[PDB]
């Protein structure tokens, strides 16, 4: 289906079958930030998969980022 | 079906079947931040799946952030 | 079905079958924040899916994060 039709209007929003996501600010005030990590074995074969995927930030597998952002 | 028809009209809306999720401000005043982890086995063969999925943030899989934002 | 017809009217809103979820603000206000974590085992096969999802935030799977935001 998903016919979507329109004749006017100012400012309208249609959204059929779909994924949104927000967000907002992030703020972390301080004055010291120590981290510490030790990662041993993370991934010994493991499949993965993606299709029609979005991300609004760093994609990543098997990782020790440590601080993100 | 999803049909979704409009003949005029300031602003207004319409979401058929789908998902939207929102968020606000995270913010985080302190001093001090520390952080200790040891992680030894995350994934073992962990199959995984997506299809049509969004994130507002860092994908990921099989990590040991540490600290997000 | 799923027909949403309109003619005018402003800023009026129709929301047929869907998932919406919302959420405010987060504050945090301290002088020291302190972790430890040891995770030993998480994932031994865990078979995972999703479709159609959606997510306000940072997607993982089989994580240690140890301080979100």
Avoid: M
Wanted: hydrophobic share 35%.
């Amino acid at each position: 289906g998903n016919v979507t039709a329109d004749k006017d209007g100012v400012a309208d929003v249609s959204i059929e079958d779909s994924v949104i996501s927000l967000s907002g600010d992030h703020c972390i005030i301080g004055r010291t930030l120590v981290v510490h990590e030790k990662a041993d074995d993370l991934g010994k074969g493991g499949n993965e998969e993606s299709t029609k995927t979005g991300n609004a930030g760093s994609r990543l597998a098997c990782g020790v980022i440590g601080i993100a952002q």
